[PDB]
Amino acid sequence: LEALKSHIMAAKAVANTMRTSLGPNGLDKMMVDKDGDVTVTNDGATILSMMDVDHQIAKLMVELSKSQDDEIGDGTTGVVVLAGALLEEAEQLLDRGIHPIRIADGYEQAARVAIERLDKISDSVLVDIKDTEPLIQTAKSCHRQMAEIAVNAVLTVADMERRDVDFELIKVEGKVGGRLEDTKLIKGVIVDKDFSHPQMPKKVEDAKIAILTCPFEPPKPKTKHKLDVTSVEDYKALQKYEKEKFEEMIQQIKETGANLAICQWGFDDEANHLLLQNNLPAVRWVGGPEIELIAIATGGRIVPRFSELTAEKLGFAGLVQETKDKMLVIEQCAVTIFIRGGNKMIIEEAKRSLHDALCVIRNLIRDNRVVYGGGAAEISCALAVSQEADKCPTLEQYAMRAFADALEVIPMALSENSGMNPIQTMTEVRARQVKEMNPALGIDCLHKGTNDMKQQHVIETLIGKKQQISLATQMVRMILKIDDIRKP
Amino acid sequence: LEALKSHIMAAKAVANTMRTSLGPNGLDKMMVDKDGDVTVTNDGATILSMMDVDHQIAKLMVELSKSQDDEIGDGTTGVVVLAGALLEEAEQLLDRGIHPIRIADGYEQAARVAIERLDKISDSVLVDIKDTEPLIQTAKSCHRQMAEIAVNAVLTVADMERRDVDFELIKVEGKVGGRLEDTKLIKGVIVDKDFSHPQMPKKVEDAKIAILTCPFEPPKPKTKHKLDVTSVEDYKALQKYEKEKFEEMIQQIKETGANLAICQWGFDDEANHLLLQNNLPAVRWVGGPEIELIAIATGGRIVPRFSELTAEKLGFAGLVQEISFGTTKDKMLVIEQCAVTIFIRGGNKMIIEEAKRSLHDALCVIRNLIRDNRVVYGGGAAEISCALAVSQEADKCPTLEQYAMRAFADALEVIPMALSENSGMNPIQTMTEVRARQVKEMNPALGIDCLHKGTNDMKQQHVIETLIGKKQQISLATQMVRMILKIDDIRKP
Amino acid sequence: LEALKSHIMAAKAVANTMRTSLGPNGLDKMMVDKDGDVTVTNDGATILSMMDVDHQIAKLMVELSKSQDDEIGDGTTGVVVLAGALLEEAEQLLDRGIHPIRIADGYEQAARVAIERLDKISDSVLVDIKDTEPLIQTAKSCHRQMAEIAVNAVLTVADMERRDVDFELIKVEGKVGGRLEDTKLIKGVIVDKDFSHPQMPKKVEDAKIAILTCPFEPPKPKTKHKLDVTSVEDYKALQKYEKEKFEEMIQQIKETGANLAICQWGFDDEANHLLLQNNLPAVRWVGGPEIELIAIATGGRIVPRFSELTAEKLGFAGLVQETKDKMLVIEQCAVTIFIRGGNKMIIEEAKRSLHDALCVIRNLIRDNRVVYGGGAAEISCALAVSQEADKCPTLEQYAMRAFADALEVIPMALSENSGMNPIQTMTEVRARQVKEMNPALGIDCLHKGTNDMKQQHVIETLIGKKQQISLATQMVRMILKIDDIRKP
Amino acid sequence: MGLEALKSHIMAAKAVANTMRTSLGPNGLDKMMVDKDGDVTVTNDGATILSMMDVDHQIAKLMVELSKSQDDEIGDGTTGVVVLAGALLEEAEQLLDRGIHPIRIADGYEQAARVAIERLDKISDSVLVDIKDTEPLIQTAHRQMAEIAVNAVLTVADMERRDVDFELIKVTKLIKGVIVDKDFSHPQMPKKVEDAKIAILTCPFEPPKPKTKHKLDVTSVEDYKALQKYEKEKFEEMIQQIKETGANLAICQWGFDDEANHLLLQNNLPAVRWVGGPEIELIAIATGGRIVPRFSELTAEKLGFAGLVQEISDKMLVIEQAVTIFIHDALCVIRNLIRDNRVVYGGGAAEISCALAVSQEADKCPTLEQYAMRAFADALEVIPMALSENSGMNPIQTMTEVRARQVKEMNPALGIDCLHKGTNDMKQQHVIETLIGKKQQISLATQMVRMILKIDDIR
Ligand SMILES: Nc1ncnc2c1ncn2[C@@H]1O[C@H](COP(=O)(O)OP(=O)(O)O)[C@@H](O)[C@H]1O
Ligand SMILES: Nc1ncnc2c1ncn2[C@@H]1O[C@H](COP(=O)(O)OP(=O)(O)O)[C@@H](O)[C@H]1O
Ligand SMILES: Nc1ncnc2c1ncn2[C@@H]1O[C@H](COP(=O)(O)OP(=O)(O)O)[C@@H](O)[C@H]1O
Ligand SMILES: Nc1ncnc2c1ncn2[C@@H]1O[C@H](COP(=O)(O)OP(=O)(O)O)[C@@H](O)[C@H]1O
């Protein structure tokens, strides 16, 4: 049986590692690590992205933590903290003599209760005309225009009518240099890597693009091959040969519309020369990522060849201009935002913040409902779970109450990270929720305010919490049922 | 003799490992493998499929567990648990002074008794109209459409008139991403991979398929060559040659009907080039399986050549498509000459692999029912009544087989006991009370809830294990115990 | 002197290993072993076939155990058990002060006595019209038709007139799948490996076969060789060359009669193509074993060439047909039986049983005499040996009595394997043989019957026992004389 | 430890049971058994074995005195008690592993014991009393032994009724009372002490040394001879004290020696010396006589009324206020027959019929006690098996065939020959275990197993 307690202990370790980074006052960690740079961040989603590999059960949790929440929802730290708490209680319930399967079934019952109780606390947010602008400022002073950019980005490209699914279709590329919120919103894709030769004309109008992934030397189907190159004459004949078929690539592209092209893999030495004369010149190269962006945005049917391009495909951009990066306007349609800043730390922080923003909006587009955070929704869920537990017989009663006390960890953790007395403030808030009948208040947490939390606008959406609880109960289910730990 | 006790101890060790995974409340076993991912499942069939292969007796239990039950029936974990119990009892019989061959004889006779008793407990199930669907709910809250697609799958592909033996020509593919209720109704066979090339036609309709196991390169003498190209003109002569002989095979396929082709082995550098320019979207590349699927489904008469074919061979498919799931892509085709294949999108990566085994249980169950339509009620009930009959026959038998029969009777009762402990109930208390409620109520159905919700009657909850599942379970268990009870010295050079 | 006791001990070890697998209730062992499959069987003949190599003297026994009995007779387990017993007695006789050479000479005397006494117990079995059918059912419910198949197989192909020697000429090939005794008897050879291409016509009538072992590329007598393949023209000229000489193999075969051929070694890629057009197509390949079967059955003079075939040889089969194996009928003459079953364990068990059958019949054809088994013949032999020992003086007296007590191990072992008290039942049977004067009864052994053993039809033939005793005394002779154990 | 200490006690006790499992029945093994500087003692009958051996585990010592203080002091058969206890524990192990609580197993063993005990009433066979029959009934334990034992226990018995007595017997001739060795010391004394008042004194005979700084100093004749004379007079004090309360002979431990024994002759006080507990408490329980810790301070009262005391070449006393044999086994058996005159046939037969009863009654039982009773049946069946293997027969074979012949022939008698010569009927050979022997055996074994089952932790 102690195999279960080994799993429960190793998982509680991960939880205690992560519960210090919960909330706005969370901590950062270090991570590095492949002789490379460092990353200091809250938001456990990127914390789990590294996390040295040790115990098998811990990695079961690391896989399932990203599995749904980080990939679809937002809140990741909460999943692992809640899971660890549920395990902390399942320990003292296992000691009391209850069988694990009974613990898991009880946690299922309680989970369904809390989820069914998040709908009663829910609040609605409408779409299609701003109003989500003030809903984003919560996701992070500098928020007012960032919200504008976010909504304007997601609403322009979204299924929305109807289906209620986004695309993305959207990444972000920041330039070190500028000042904070001088960031700009665009309508089309933007890439780095310039024209490959300085003498090219900037500004290519109504451009017909040529997306190709091929090398530039004509190959031969593989035979024993070798060569002879006997007389110097044949040497010059060979040079002349591929020098001819370098043009066979140039005007062949120009027959289907030229302007500028786009190449992957290699771009030869004198190729840029022969391409400069014909006003074709492309770019090299940045593969798949940033290639498929231009593929979906304009045209484009990426061509793996090598002389087989016929249009048909490609097109149709209207502007391509600039000190090292080239950016393009007027597309066939596709948005990829742009960010200013300085010191390299003013950017990449706003990228994390933005990520939070886009995620929130997408979730609202799918289902537009919100519950109020700061542990308030957790507390009320615990009230309902405990209430249903008082009316339930047999052993699942105790497992349900354990679920309640486990949910009450989020207010406690939020309190610890801000320096408040955990159980004291947590208890006071639970009391103030029973009376007042206000499932909105709890954990300031910013040390400034009236604690109402309906103010301060702290929203955790709705699918975010239902996915957090569902994933947590799913994990704890596995960990409770895992034994033997085979492995070769 | 102690070699036998070593075998009995190791075998009971395997059994004790998997007696916690018995029933719906069974446990998981982490089970990582090689340099790859992990797999956590109940249903010992996969457990035995990997496990830790060490002792030759454990190897024997894997050998025979997959030999018959996993390949034909369904229940595997029960076989190893029952064999373990029979061994645990036969050990004390060894100590009692009984010869092993006599214990195996008694176990054989008792096994025949129980087997013959399952027929008396049997019940009938109708066929051909919506009657098996509600009885698939035992194999697994997504059941409502799972059972539906199950019966549809096995009834669409079956001998059925009559002979009542059919399997395979049906596979399952999970593409990972969605929720379990996103599972869809199915039509024809569906495979992965791609036609290659992005400029390919992504939807080829009314396709005549050409299935080939051949390389696409023009062959060479394979004598000892030193091919040395002299003049640059001969460089171009080489390129021209293979550029032409790659095409000599293209319109060779197009003269017998083209659309799209199908290739094993290599699809060369240019090749796909020359096939795009000639508008022949072939595909590459897949081994025996998934080749013979499209072979039997449409057409197809797999061609071992290589420029030699007349069609004839090509099949008649109505639609072939390429759909992109997330980033990666799989090409799936509909409207075949007929052959159906199921599809699952579960999400979370672990929500699938559950639906695959749970569905497999469905195909197996329905297949067994078509072969012989009879059911005994599960939850250990059939085991309890079988133990009752075995003890009854044992009280009236003299000499040494008497003791072996009683040991068999007590060994059957481990299934209700394991089912009891895995659900949190007192193992011997509930099992005993049920064994009394089966003689007093004369109802060979009730016993071990086991879901901790219900009337314990087991007539409701409709838990069915068919018949050949149980008959093969007991036959395989007694076969294992028979072999293990013999065998000494374990040479192992 | 203790070198002798080391040999005697190491040999007694092998004996004790084997005496549990004696009789119908014998045990199985495991064997495996080269990262391969397992084999669980009675009949020590296949047990000695593996048996890890340890002591030199043990391997002297393993070589001599197969030397004659398994290769010609049947009973192998009895040889090693009897040898071990003779050694067990030779130990206590060596301690008594008798020289080994005297022990061996006494064992010779006693062996000659017992052998000379097996003729008095002998019984005759006639040949040429069934009657051997009920003689086979003893060799293993399912026996009635198997006996039919066995006699019908051996009598059709045997010298028999006269010479009294078989051939074999006969193997067995079973197909997993079927039901038990649905096995069939044929008149001709049968092989696997199909026609090598599906488009061939099944059923090749009055076929003229072409048995060849050669590769298909024309070689050159070895010189420094190399090549040049300069111009593409010469490349195509080379391809054309061997493409021509591939036909030079085809119609060359068709000139001497074609139908189907048979090839060993490799069969090239496009060779099956060029052979499909000309209605020649052969098979690849399964070497010597199953090749020489068709050689002796039809024709065939296996040709190692490579263009030198002229007929003369080859011929003359009448049918070749079928889901993976091809079988042929109507030959020039040659029998190889066929077996149904299921689970892979229903077959290969009947193969072992069959092996026993064929061996018995062959032995009867050589010399048609039988003694009754179950240890009865052993007991009576012990009675005669002890009787001659009471009238013999000097030291060989004790060695002879030791031979008697050593023969009496077979009834004891047979008793142990069935669970009876060894010395009690053995003694009772010896008594019941002295009175009643019936050298037929002893050791049930099936726990069901009247113990008469003239019933139950338990026959061990005659050469089987005389060879068992001769081989046993031969072994014990060596082991008794071996000393020094040189070795590099 | 908490629980595994239970399995440890099972192992430790069944170790003892397996030690003495070979010494059961007539073909038992003798066990060398020396003792320190002592000699060899080779016998069956574990009764004397349990006295020896060693204190290994406190449960192994708990096996003793439960198998001794009762069955050796009440019944006769000791080895069966420990063998049975070991078997019961062995099956209780399988019941423990099955998930059954220990106290439930102990209770089940109690109820099963009730079934078996109450049977023995049904298997029983009565024997007549008051003459003969008992004599030919003793040849089991060569002719006169029956007679002398019969009349010896006949002379000392309650008989009307309650039927109990022991211990007035110990150790070929007949006997008139209890007898002692040694002499009255100094044969000039009278050998005819008839109508003797015995003065039982376990004490020294010395001048009462005062308590003060002592160190005597003496100079030859004057003081020395006065010292000898002094303690001789002080000896006459005790002499004249014993004659004032009572008369004639006395009995003394410790020292006499010196002249001393001379003086008592001149005063006609033929005492005896010297012996410890035995032969002191023997004549104490026989005649009179209590015990005096003094040393001249007593009232009588105490003295015994022995009628005759004589000396023959060992002095013996007759007619006591008690008869003892002169040259074990049947003497206890007869006592049991005096208590209850019924017998059941032995050789494991009573165990087999009891097992058939406990199992027949166990088939109809709810809850867990079912398995406990069945285990009890399989426990009683170890006596026929052990009996079988000790003679060389196949254990389970002979045992099973007999258990079948008992229900088919309806004969709670036949089973285990065992001497390899007989008709197996057990009616002949006249092998009888009485009733109190078996009933006490089962009660004691079950008491043991229950005790061990309750115990846990225990240091
Ligand atoms: N202004 C705020 N006041 C109180 N709590 C907050 C506030 N903003 C965020 N939180 C809390 O922080 C918790 C976790 O968010 P975060 O630390 O970003 O990690 P994750 O989003 O991965 O859980 C949420 O449960 C939320 O209640
Ligand atoms: N709803 C149920 N109630 C009671 N027992 C069940 C139920 N479903 C399955 N079982 C039991 O589970 C046992 C084994 O099934 P499982 O644990 O899936 O492995 P396997 O099928 O390989 O033996 C069966 O003997 C059956 O009696
Ligand atoms: N039906 C039978 N009853 C009694 N003994 C038998 C019977 N069949 C075979 N045997 C005995 O089995 C012995 C050995 O046969 P087997 O175990 O096959 O090994 P091997 O033939 O190599 O000695 C023979 O000596 C024979 O007496
Ligand atoms: N003649 C006999 N035949 C069969 N069994 C006997 C015979 N005499 C004694 N026994 C058995 O021996 C058993 C034990 O006696 P024993 O070994 O002397 O030691 P104890 O009497 O102390 O147990 C008794 O249970 C009795 O049944």
Ligand SMILES: [Mg+2]
């Ligand atoms: Mg957050």
Ligand SMILES: [Mg+2]
């Ligand atoms: Mg299952």
Ligand SMILES: [Mg+2]
């Ligand atoms: Mg044989």
